[model samples]
Target: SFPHRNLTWNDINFVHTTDTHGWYSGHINQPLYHANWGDFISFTTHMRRIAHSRNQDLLLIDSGDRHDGNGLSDITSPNGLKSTPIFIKQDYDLLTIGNHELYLWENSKQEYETVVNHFQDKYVCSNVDIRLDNGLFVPLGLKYKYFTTPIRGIRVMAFGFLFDFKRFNSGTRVTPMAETIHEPWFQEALKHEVDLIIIVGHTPISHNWGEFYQVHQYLRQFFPDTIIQYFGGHSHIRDFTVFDSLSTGLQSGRYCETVGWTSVNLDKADLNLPVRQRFSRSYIDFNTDSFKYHTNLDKEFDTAKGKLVSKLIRETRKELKLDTLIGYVKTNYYVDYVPIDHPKSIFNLLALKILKTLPKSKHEERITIINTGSIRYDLYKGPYTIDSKFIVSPFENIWVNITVPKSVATKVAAKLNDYISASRLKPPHQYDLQVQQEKLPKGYVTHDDFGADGDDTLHRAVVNFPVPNVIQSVEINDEVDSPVNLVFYSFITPNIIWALKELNFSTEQVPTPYSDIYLGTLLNEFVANNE
Candidate 1:
């Protein structure tokens, strides 16, 4: 764990987190962020005790996207449930649902059947709902929850919301924020009196991202004087926004890296005066060192629960056989090491290697394309393991090949790259106005300039700054209606299909059976068989 500075406590303290993405095992490879759920539990427990002693309120809140990252969420059959039970052991005060929770029917069902009811009143999804077995729709958890805080009956009302998410699976209905506010349930919830209004949801607060802005307006209309605090997620960035004089929104950094600290001095709110709540916020590295420093503990502070969680994470890793040797990499290949077109680019590394071993078209030369985003992290020079495979490219995306006219196929290579970087194709729109209005972190001025913004290890140097988006591929002959194979993983299916249609390219599914193998397996099989 790393520490930038210390914290200043208040009458009401909140440990905010979002887009954890199932890193309960924690950042094992990186020391700066190597604390697991067990450690986080111990940290929160101790912090809560501190609040109790100070006669303050300490609440744990999450903004969702809990599924789909490491082994915890990925290893289970239903995606995120296996590791969730272990996660809920921390006892969050307020939790909301994320888009990932609704990606598949099974995942959505599992959350309703198990996690939703398990958290009881703590779980809230105000604008999201589930169409029950009888086809009647109801709030996924509760419309709103009311509870009194530790500070002498300090009334608090909490509501959870997901943004305008259109990608929900069947049986899951995400109501628009405009419609949700009009509903009788939301209208009724606002009638209740509360000293504090806490809004937690799964959307970024920085941009005018749909429901987040509307929800703020709705809350302000009802509780004009009450302190309003919002925690948001999904954009997976550290952001803070001021909704009004009495309200603030904070989004913690993602991937189990930063634990957000937001506190409000609820003890000093006066209605007669133009009262603005005293809110202090900080971004703390999710590591033991920072935790201990905050808790005023010396070099020695590791709890039993923390150690147990670490052991459980270790066991889970082993059980998944994530550490089993697959192959040895020669050098560390970072996704952001260089531009997409550069020889050292991560997209080129994976796609080029695959192209080398992949079977050629029966009649002609083939082309291949892959999105750079699929490659998640850096590949270090060492013994590669099953865990390493998922860490680099975790999704179980399928590989498919199609055929198109060589004229269109040749353009495919450059066009794919152009599409990704299209925004960068010209000077940013309203660039000056955008920068002036931009609300970046307190200590840092937000810039698109290339460099290590979030790297943990101070001693280790970032390799190179790369700007361009990538579409890894091989050179192909642009002659006639060539029966060439164009290969790529399933994640880029949308872009590929759109490009193919626009160019009048025809798909050519490999004649042979290519059903079962995925991107991960395809890479592993090639590695084990060839090198």
Candidate 2:
């Protein structure tokens, strides 16, 4: 058995996940996060039983971003048709909308019809609404949820919210947070008496910049004595923050890599007295071993229902042809574990090799500029399948080109780099903690507000290298003096235009579609051709 710390159970506990991004099958290449949704179902089932036996209460929550990022979610016709069925297998008490869900009209519409309808009152959408074909606007889900726990009968009031996102489909509307909290309906709900207040959303949990901090401060003015717990997402990291002595926040890591656990002692709480309660949190690695250890189950860990879901996942993958072998890698190329200029860095590979394979342009003199965010995950050394392509780069962004003078094109990359130099594109955890002396595998070593013992499983620390917001294929050759084609993804067209304008270039030059093929298709073809 693996050596790990045990969870501190209390009168009330919560199991939370966010920014899953349709990784229901989990990471096949990374052993630390290898457990699929089926394993999670079994783990939760056993944990609930344990809570019930101790006369305590347990709840499940998902903050949002359940769409995109994997083959199962992106390969379907309606985008999440194959994955949503598997995601709904879990019994989440509170669910919310994420930025990914509202990026496209069809995905948002599909979520409203299937997920929101299935969960009913269990889902809460504090400030988002969908416009029906008839032009009537309805909240994406329930505005707020008030209910009582099963075993302890503890009263709970929960609300789900999204940040002020601007690029959502025209079919949906997202009310700003400041405006939403002042609504008559929201003010009316705040008048209720509840033992606990939960604020769950796809917003970050940072005290300085997160929307949660504002909401928490506003809520404290009303219920100064009541305990407030916030679960946040979007800035995917293993994070915990203490807003006050009576309130706290937790944010789980992204991509099904962590199962967040939190417990609080509420049996001794008194609203009349100065609030002091025991609080504990652990970021559980997503794997069968960790699941078995936490649940105190061995061979009996897999419940019948969990097994069925596992079977469904396998069948879906087979039907989608996700595992079809496309290529193989010679070595691992990490996104953040190594320096951007390192030979093994994923960004370097894209600049030196991958982008070089782009469909030949009539004009051979061109430079491709793409945002580092386009590449989502590391490239592992092993069999590369169709699923691997989606896992690494899942966006449907197409290529676009604009003609510019060689001098102007040469300055674009530097100008864009300067604009984003302060805004590094690495994961959030990199800025929080440092390496430890302990020897273990490379994994998350979280140091949240609760302290350094937040991770249930111990691990050796991995360093984070600074990655630029954008990267370029190559520098302009000295021999070339004529104008060249500037290539980029359609998603970052605005950034390109902004950079061009900064160079005093007129906006008359418009970008045209360079190719009809998408990023995923290009990666797939590259892999097949390379193999």
Candidate 3:
């Protein structure tokens, strides 16, 4: 039994998730986030009944990025084919397209053929389109949806959007948010008779990205007095922002680590009057204890559907060989919780141990560079399984090498760090965690726009240190003036090129493939061969 604050219910409530990234099995090693997708289903079921019993309304929403983070999604052919079945089992009222869904043509096509087909009108893609074989582009999903809440009879209009993404595959298109808002279809949707306007998108709520902010401001122009609730993702931090007196936004944390709860008291609101309404938000930790506490169930917490989903997840893991033991780790390696140079830091391990173990070139001394963002999660102290490989580094990036002078090669890491300092290519929470402190357990002490009391479970805060955008490892001692091979992952090719150009090392030498094996496979092979 852990201490927790009771949730404040209102006339209308919401259960929101975003950037799940195929963590359907959840965090197995971390007890703080141990609950799986099956547990979430049971929690939502009970919450819905509780709302209906009180004549209130509850709706579920997801802001996207459901692919590319876990083995369940990454290890499969075409990606998200197996995991989508488990994900679609959750009965979401509204969902939006994410940038991850557009990174590859095959992934986006699978989403279009499977997820979009399943949700139909519930899945909105207001600014996204898919290119067909004949060259015609069509909206990936419904542009907008207008409906009424079942119990409270509250009319709701919803629109989904993605950020101004430019890296999508050739088979898809992403219209900028600024232009999408002015479209005739969008302007015409504003004419609907709805009491609530819900904007769900894969854009961060607090960032000045202008995607969610622009949509909020535009909606206010026509329905100034109506209540608007915005749910956003992409930055993957637990955040909330108030756009106006009658409008607000919520962003659940990434990787199924959090399930966001928001409530609005619309029972006695006079839209014509200039009065601020009551709103409550909570960042529920993804764990069974948190789920049980919220639903007030103990023995009967697991519903039939939830149990079935759990069974399916277990079978899928077995079939995928996700639990096959690769090696054993003696200690934990953190991402940002510790300093970049700390022995326990994953970055340190990569620099000093993992990357150094790679096959060395016989010709010249080499330096390997990789972006820290490519490493997704922390490495825990226990059995390291195949699934654990994907949990730590999921990208299928191969090694690439470019020959450069030793002077230019040594300066590349510093130059890349300089660029990252200005742009801050890392995740958003690293800066926010530096501002707060707490003591129940080392977990999220979220201080959003609302205040520090947003988390449902009162826990201690963990400190996060700033890590460089890229790290490098030097191999073999050689003369300072000798030419060196600059090795790096294919994913950070653009960054490497920019750094090299900035260093004034003008070279026509493009990055050539150094190894056929991927980074994940290298890690797995190292672990497998160790013990």
Candidate 4:
């Protein structure tokens, strides 16, 4: 009874894919995502074939975040077309919208409105509303619906959803997530007795599954015939967990890195079901496994998708002029996967420039010139493009002029150091670390003698927070490096002071009246200025 009868591929099914952050590079140095997306394309193709061969059900769905990020999304305008024009549309059954969908203003939103919304009709923002000129609350997504299979006489109710996003600018609105289920429209979708209920959204599976589980259970009471399956994103991990007694949610990880698979058994009683309703998914390599799985896919790019992706990249590259720009380079620091040993590296030089540029900041009060955390990613000494500049320093950190006293600046630097040593770090989020000297595949870095890289991508947060802004050291490194004093925010300084002491670095703590600028705001300003 426990082993579950060595279940074959008959009774189960799965909905997979997520956080494909405009990685349309379709070809990257990283073996993980490049292979993952492709393999997923293959896995999806196979799943469909198997479904058809067995006369069973298999649905392919992406739980938002397919757009934005990467050079593709940010590079392109009007639509931010990444590599998706090539393979994305054909595989997805349902695609949800993630936060990245909103970043670029009208061009992006319009792209979502026209190209995406046209075909991917079901953008499920249950609580969200677009305020019309008349102040009418028009909901953002397609209300729920019943997905029916006439051939098999099976019916499933499904809908896409997004978490409650507070800042959607002026035109868009995110209704309270809690209130979505209670809506008459949502209730009506559930009221129609369907075979199963599939919920897809941008929220992750781990942290907020309880909320959706409650919704499922409440609905289950009415539609006993229904089985619930949830797919989610935002957590950037290949996470899986059971929510209720019956429902399960799986997050496949950000980008096309992990093609999540789960086969759910529908008619456990139907002996006619194949020996494998077994919904199984994994980190499928994209190269051969992805495209070739389907005989239709040949060696070349999928014509239509290839064109779309290419067009987008070309357009964005032209607009951003990503290929022609130039920035100074310093000693190549190792970025993640690759070590930086180049005679000249853009990022290192940029780091030095950031401190040097500080003098240009022209703030009345004593202010810091550098933030170690801010100096993310090193650049190769080659022809730098706009995309290169943006991607290398995508966070486009703003010039924050804090009015901290000389005293407070002394302490803040110390606090941030503590977070890194403690192992509870975030990422270069406040800025971009894409071009660092020694960065590697974002997730899954096992070989390093340091430790397992199972997860630890967002450490940039710890550097920005927890520590008070202060200057741990004021003297410049005259020997090999310039004399650059370590700086910080006094507010977060106390908690992590140990970091400075550990390095034997002297610090000068200082207090400040106000600190300014989130990364988003900074990037926008940079883009505007540079453009």
Candidate 5:
């Protein structure tokens, strides 16, 4: 349980959740966040009641990534369609899309037709849009929304945005953050006056060079004194940052593991002056105790809506057979809990065990490589089910192999690591850096628990695995290799061709057709054969 701290209630308060990643049923093995959606619903209902009692305003918002991480979101006849309804039942006041939603066109379409349609205008994506059937592109949801609370009459203007996500498949589009600010709609949206400028985004809060940072600058030009409350996600950690006295950003940890609480004292001081330390924030571990502590409850808490939703999720899991046992794990394997070469590392597991299921080829010997990102989550020591497997690797990536000369094979991964390093190292314009360094608190720097360079939780002592710039078997000392038949590997076939060219490897030289095996099948085979 987290430290018990009373929230600083104010005129406007926010209950924020982000990067939930479909753990609506509950986290089974992970003890940090074991509460299910039922518990969460109860928390929300009680939270609303608390706000009503104080005659304050409360907004329940989610920053997205609602699909593809657990049984409910990953398992369906068509995948994620059934889980969409489960998410809808939460009744979030504001929602936004994340990169996971745009990875596959079909999933994007599912989001457009189902989740987006369900939330309607409340779903804001100021910098995100979709290609419509009318041969034009438009915001997937409302570009911006303005509303007022009935109780407090607090006026609010809300904008939802995703970072500069370019990996989206065809049929979807993400507007560049800076460009979105120039749009006529955004310009007009900023013109109106509001009590609070709220931003719900799938972008990280700080140490980020994307949406939230840019959106803050844009909004400050208009709503200078307005209290700007930002709810952000996609980094999967609990964190907080202050852009100014008037603006504070909060990100909830992932997998329903954390629910972020923030209260802004709109009347703390005259609107002309800077904020008077009037904003308070906290990360509540997702458990009934924490919920009850905040709500002043002494016993078990469950609402009828919460109970019925839990029953629905249980039945849906049964109907989908997501909990069907597939294998037993002997230990937990973390993505960043150890060096990538360690036995418990996901990189090592992919190379030594999971990648071994690749089809036998015409080559004499083979060496495998997989991106650190391909393995999405850690593996827990317990009953491994279909849901567990899907959560670990949910994308539709396929296995791809290439036969490169030994000289080129040894160099492929190292070169791509350089590419990744170079991409991340792009320096901010000098003035931008100077400006940020001057404003940010001293000793303020951020790093990720995972390899993604952006986890907001400041737990530096957590068990972490460092993935090198590139992933390949050469980094590990399993055995030796030599041959022109040196087979190479990757799950993302397109990235392979791109990386190959940078290293001067040619199609005719490294000739091999993409394998028909889907990553899901290969993992299934690994489980079936090993178990």
Candidate 6:
């Protein structure tokens, strides 16, 4: 109707998108990702209009794992980078789950309920179940959804799958992919014997491709010639491969890196027909018409979607209060994220107070340990804000206890040093800024210090400063450093303090009032301790 290619069953198809990862704002507004999700939506809308005018059918799909990572996704709570508004309005016929959805706490649970509740029977988890908001159990499966082809009389069924997974907390479970479809309930749910089984599970179509073949072989044995096609995700890579004579599995890469597509021509004829039209060259092809077709939506992201996402991200920034930078960091001085160096590191910088503020310790001596992988970003020099804090160490810290013998503690410390040293050998690394180190970040050399990537990847490491090591059989003086009061936020150094208490070490409150500048106080204490 609108004009252009009149290609019939001889050639036509649709595209796929998967593993978006909460990048709702699309890309970072760069030349490489100019066609953001909004641009994509506009393109999708236009294509549907084009397809409708031509009297042809078109479909859009996502292979799941659409949350987590990046600033947008991790930038909120309630609905972190909630793309629901965008998703609901899209032309997606089937949507699936990815691993990221299972990584967060309430986020995962809420997301699961929201999607299933909204779509009702539209979600296609063949082997999963859950309690509904209404307090009743529900099958988290659509069983199957049928889509009649553009060429009437052809129908297809679609659904999803998750790889064998464990790390999920209580209240959730993932079915092992290999055994899910075999259950009688699942087999009968789809009525198994369909003209075509269109699957879009979280299991990628590559690497151990036999699973797809195993599925295809069994299904084909029943229908003999029914075409079965699949699109999968999770591996974060792009791939296209044939699983059987009658099937094709395609996986689009992670993020919005690429879109995938596939199509099949229907037999639409009975073998008894005069000229044997049943098998008369049924066609299938991946055409640019589809890719170009999908990339050309007439829709523009409305202010509502943008505003809501903005508010959520804004709230996160506010809550984390990442605006205030504790201090300017010149060299690379990551906090406890690389915990081995103890007191001299940012974590140690932050934890000294917590260690000192143990409400009067029961033991004479205690040890503290922290994991170094916790700090998320480096603190850049110059009047940093709370936002800087969130980036430098985004995760809140909590303390726990672990018992170890004195000998064991020494060995563990040695192992910790080895672990950190080994970790440092591979490019840019962390050092303590409090006690001063070789080549510290600029901002750390007093308030004027600044941190570097320490290496040359995309981002910089924490402030570059060497924290003093206090475990080397050094004699301790009972007198407190004049300005020994340390300041620290409770969210980032619980582990070190907890380890200290567990090691049966004793602590005492500094006689002076607590200082808001915990890092500064700790550094002063460290310098005096060494002197």
- Model 3, stretches more than 4 Å misplaced? 207-210, 267-277, 420-439
Model-by-model lDDT, in order? 0.70, 0.84, 0.85, 0.48, 0.71, 0.46
Tens-digit lDDT track of model 6 for 1-531: 011222222123555777665544443212233234544554556555566675555667677766543444443575443455445545576776665566445655666667655666456776444455576655555645766556433567776776655544444566665687687765665564466667877775663535565666666656666666677776644455555455566666555645554444544324332221211111111222222433342233233543444455445445545343345444444533344345434554445443454332343333444334444333333454433433344333333333333433443333433422311211112231223243322111111011221111121122333332222221113332221112223432333344334556555532122223333233333333431
Cα error, candidate 6, residue 113 (Å): 4.0
Error of 3 at 335 (Å): 0.5
Model 3 C-alpha lDDT versus the unseen true structure: 0.85
Clash count (model 6, backbone only): 70
Candidates in order, TM-scores: namely: 0.84, 0.94, 0.95, 0.65, 0.87, 0.55
**Candidate 4, residue 237: how far the Cα is off, in Å:** 1.3
For 1-531, candidate 2 gives per-residue lDDT tens digits of: 357889988888999999998999978887888999999999999999999999999999999998677988988877899999999999999999998899899999999999999999899999999999899999999999999999999899999889767778999999978789889999999999999998998887877556777787788889987888989888778888888877888899899999999897774345442322467889999998889999988989999989999999999999999999988878899987887789999888888877767776454678898888777888898899988887888888888999888878888988887763333333434443333355565688887787788888888865677676778886445556777789998877888888898999995878998876776666667666643
Tens digit of per-residue lDDT, candidate 4, span 1-531: 000011124444564667766654443434434543334444455566666777777667777655544555555544454344543444566666676565445643564455456555544555545555686766555655566753466677777667655445566666544677777777676657666677888775553334565566667677654457788776565655555444567667655555555666665333343322323333333344333432234454334443454565566456656555444332343333231112243323333333333332232333243343332333444334445444444433333333333444454444453343322123212222222123322333211111222122311111112212222223332233222233333423443345445545454644333334433333333333342
TM-score: which is higher, 1 or 3? 3
Model 2 alpha-carbon drift over 4 Å, by segment:
267-277, 420-439, 475-480
List candidate 6 stretches off by more than 4 Å. 1-12, 52-55, 103-105, 133-136, 150-153, 190-193, 209-213, 266-531
In candidate 3, position 338 carries an lDDT of: 88
**Number of clashes recorded per candidate:** 3, 0, 0, 90, 4, 70
lDDT of 2 at 485: 80
Q: What TM-score does model 3 achieve against the real structure? A: 0.95
Poorly placed runs, candidate 1 (over 4 Å): 1-3, 208-210, 267-277, 355-360, 412-470, 478-483, 489-492, 500-515, 526-531
Candidate 4 deviant stretches above 4 angstroms: 1-15, 35-47, 76-91, 103-108, 207-217, 220-225, 268-279, 289-385, 395-400, 409-531
Minimum summed lDDT over a 10-residue window in model 6 is located at: 276-285
Our model 5 lands, by Cα RMSD against the true structure, at 6.2
Off by over 4 Å in 5: 1-3, 268-276, 298-300, 421-461, 474-494, 506-512
